[PDB]
């Protein structure tokens, strides 16, 4: 494919179209401007110019996410701070995003600053060190997010590194929350840590886990103890989204826990994320699964189809890679589900883990 357009412009256009589809109005316009502000550092880069990203498994450095739950529409992007020809693990771009967001949007850097020296060092092991993102609803302020990688000190250092992060934030007393989330030693592993970049009392610290070689019953067992994660509903949702498969045989299931919600019996602390690009022949089949889980709620189905139509740019049956994930939490009028979609700037049908991770592992 001959690339004629910067990554930033191509994704900004798609984001603007999606915001209009979701009726986000002026908040949507500001949201697109925030996307451009966060990606200005990519410069004139076309897709071939940036290092392959971990944001979307095909290597694209953006992921769109749309909340299909019962509340008003919300739109999100995640992106990777990157510079053409500079390894993605280099920390300079990620270090520059935080002061940009603090100065231009008033995003809060307090927890970020406690973590940055440890999680954005000059010598990170893994192929990636950061993602940042933003989410907006009509009429509401944009909320900004940062994600850090727990393989910065090697693939087997994630627990020690995560504990050090909790030390720096003064939250080591929540360590048993992390530990109890591991039901199969060596196969349930923490891999990401995120911050809401806000001083609001609801600002979260989240730990994300991979469940390798897990059956659906084992994923349900992980989630059962969090309020609302009824095993029969969790197992059924997994089986719907995996086309009847009972095992996460290559791509791991993902869950997370919001640490400051685990001891408050208020907002449920947990989320399930089902990866969608390795357990289907193509995105047309994935769409059938999304429709099946949404069939009771036509409003959510129409929102989903409308957003998908503006993001897909080839026939859904050509392969996988447009759908990255769908999440699940219990909700009020229906489960809260968010769908994660790739701009697919690289190859159809990404491998398990992602092109960049596969290259790193060799
Ligand atoms: N693509 C990476 C990181 C990532 C981006 N969006 C996600 C949503 C859920 C879980 C992980 C991710 C992964 O699959 O690990
Ligand atoms: C890892 C990435 C980029 C996204 C998954 S976390 P999220 O902020 O989209 O999920 P929630 O809205 O907190 O459920
Ligand atoms: Cl030409
Ligand atoms: Zn040409
Ligand atoms: Zn070029």
- Quick one: three-class SS letters along 297-338? CHHHHHHHHHHHHHHCCCCHHHCCCCEEEEEEECCCCCCECE
From residue 171, give the alpha-carbon distance in Å to each of 167, 168, 262.
6, 8, 12
- Name 254's bridge partners: 210, 273
Residue from 52, 54, 279, 359 to probe ligand 1 pocket by mutation (most atoms less than 8 Å from CB):
54
Neighbours of 118 (CB within 10 A): 15
CA distance 345 to 134: 21
CA distance 296 to 239: 17
| Contacts with 170 (C-beta within 8 Å, 6 or more apart), sequence order | none
Q: Is the beta carbon of 145 within 6 A of some atom in ligand 2? A: yes
16, two tokens: 């603007």
Is position 145 annotated in a ligand binding site?
yes
CA distance 278 to 257: 24
Nearest ligand 2 atom to alpha carbon 329: 14
222, two tokens: 């992980």
Ligand 5 center–CA 345 separation, angstroms: 14
Which helix (H) or strand (E) covers residue 205, if one does? strand 205-211
CA distance 301 to 303: 6
- Per the listing, tokens 């627990």 go with 159
**Orientation angle between helical segments 283-294 and 298-311, nearest 10 degrees:** 160
Check the CA dihedral 68-194-360-254 and report its sign.
negative
Total length of the chain: 362
What SS3 class is residue 210?
Answer: strand
Q: For 232-286, give the DSSP string.
A: HHHHHHHHHHTTT--B--SSPEEEEEEGGGTTSSSS--EEEEEE-SSSSSSHHHH
116, two tokens: 């940055």
CA distance 96 to 122: 14
Q: Are 148 and 168 in contact (CB under 8 A)?
A: no
**Orientation angle between helical segments 92-105 and 25-39, nearest 10 degrees:** 140
Closest to 24 (Cα-Cα) out of 307, 327, 335: 307
What SS3 class is residue 71?
Answer: coil
Q: Are 35 and 61 in contact (CB under 8 A)?
A: no
What SS3 class is residue 48?
Answer: helix
User: Which residues span the domain enclosing 50?
Assistant: 1-362
Q: Are 145 and 197 in contact (CB under 8 A)?
A: yes
Please give the tally of structural domains in the chain: 1
Dihedral through CA 186, CA 256, CA 267, CA 142, nearest 10?
Answer: 160
Residue from 73, 194, 200, 204 to probe ligand 2 pocket by mutation (most atoms less than 8 Å from CB):
194
**Angstrom resolution of this structure:** 1.3
CA distance 252 to 239: 14
**Orientation angle between helical segments 216-223 and 231-241, nearest 10 degrees:** 140
The number of angstroms, rounded, from the C-alpha of 2 to the middle of its chain's C-alpha atoms is 29
CA distance 110 to 115: 9
Catalytic positions, written as ranges: 63
**263-302: b (≥16 Cβ within 10 Å) or e:** eeeeebbbbbbbbbbbbbebbebbbebbeebbeebeebbe
CA distance 317 to 302: 20
CA distance 336 to 330: 6
CA distance 210 to 155: 12
From residue 268, give the alpha-carbon distance in Å to each of 173, 225, 257.
19, 10, 9
**68-88: b (≥16 Cβ within 10 Å) or e:** bbeeebbbbbbbbbbbeeeeb
Ligand 3 center–CA 41 separation, angstroms: 26
335, two tokens: 């489960």
The number of angstroms, rounded, from the C-alpha of 164 to the middle of its chain's C-alpha atoms is 23
Closest to 153 (Cα-Cα) out of 197, 195, 123, 184: 123
Q: Which residues have CB atoms below 5 A from the ion given as ligand 4? A: 2
CA distance 3 to 10: 10
From residue 211, give the alpha-carbon distance in Å to each of 191, 234, 270, 274.
10, 15, 14, 11
From residue 32, give the alpha-carbon distance in Å to each of 14, 165, 306.
10, 32, 19
| Contacts with 351 (C-beta within 8 Å, 6 or more apart), sequence order | 57, 278, 358
Residue from 145, 198, 272 to probe ligand 2 pocket by mutation (most atoms less than 8 Å from CB):
145
CA distance 286 to 336: 18
CA distance 236 to 229: 12
| Contacts with 93 (C-beta within 8 Å, 6 or more apart), sequence order | 41, 81, 82, 83, 86, 130
Q: ∠ CA 155-159-163 to the nearest 5 degrees?
A: 135
What SS3 class is residue 26?
Answer: helix
Q: What are phi and psi of 191, to 5 degrees?
A: -135, -20
163, two tokens: 């504990």
CA distance 163 to 167: 6
Please measure the distance between the N-terminal and C-terminal CA atoms of the chain and give it in whole angstroms: 26
Pocket around ligand 1: residues whose beta carbon is below 6 Å from it? 54-55, 57, 63, 78, 254, 273, 324-325, 340, 354
Is position 338 annotated in a ligand binding site?
yes
The number of angstroms, rounded, from the C-alpha of 149 to the middle of its chain's C-alpha atoms is 12
Ligand 5 center–CA 342 separation, angstroms: 21
Q: Are 84 and 45 in contact (CB under 8 A)?
A: yes
- Name 137's bridge partners: 74
Q: What are phi and psi of 169, to 5 degrees?
A: -95, -5
Q: Are 101 and 90 in contact (CB under 8 A)?
A: no
């Amino acid at each position: 494919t001959e690339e004629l357009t910067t990554v930033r412009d191509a994704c900004a256009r798609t984001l603007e179209n999606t915001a209009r589809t979701l009726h986000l109005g002026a908040s949507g316009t500001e949201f697109v401007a925030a996307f451009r502000a966060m990606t200005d550092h990519w410069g004139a880069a076309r897709p071939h110019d940036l290092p392959l990203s971990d944001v979307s498994p095909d290597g694209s450095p953006v992921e769109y996410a749309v909340d299909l739950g019962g509340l008003a529409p919300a739109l999100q992007f995640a992106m990777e701070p990157l510079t053409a020809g500079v390894p993605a693990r280099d920390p300079l771009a990620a270090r520059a995003i935080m002061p940009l967001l603090a100065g231009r949007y008033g995003a809060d850097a307090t927890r970020w600053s406690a973590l940055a020296d440890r999680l954005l060092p000059d010598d990170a092991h893994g192929p990636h060190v950061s993602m940042y993102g933003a989410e907006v609803r009509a009429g509401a302020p944009i909320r900004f997010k940062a994600w850090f990688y727990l393989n910065v000190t090697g693939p087997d250092g994630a627990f020690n590194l995560l504990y050090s992060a909790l030390e720096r934030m003064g939250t080591t007393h929540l360590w048993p929350v992390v530990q109890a989330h591991v039901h199969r030693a060596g196969e349930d592993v923490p891999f990401l840590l995120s911050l809401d970049l806000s001083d609001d009392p609801a600002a979260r610290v989240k730990v994300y886990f991979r469940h390798f070689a897990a059956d659906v019953e084992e994923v349900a067992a992980v989630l059962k103890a969090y309020p609302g994660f009824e095993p029969g509903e969790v197992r059924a949702f997994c089986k719907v989204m995996m086309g009847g498969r009972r095992r996460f045989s290559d791509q791991p299931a993902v869950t997370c826990v919001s640490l400051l919600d685990a001891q408050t019996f208020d907002r449920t602390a947990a989320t399930l994320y089902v990866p969608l690009w390795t357990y289907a022949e193509h995105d047309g089949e994935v769409r059938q699964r999304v429709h099946r889980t949404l069939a009771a709620w036509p409003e959510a189905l129409y929102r989903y189809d409308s957003v998908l139509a503006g993001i897909a740019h080839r026939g859904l049956d050509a392969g996988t890679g447009i759908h990255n994930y769908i999440s699940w939490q219990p909700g009020r009028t229906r489960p809260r589900m968010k769908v994660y979609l790739s701009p697919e700037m690289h190859d159809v049908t990404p491998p398990p883990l992602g092109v960049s991770q596969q290259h790193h592992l060799s």
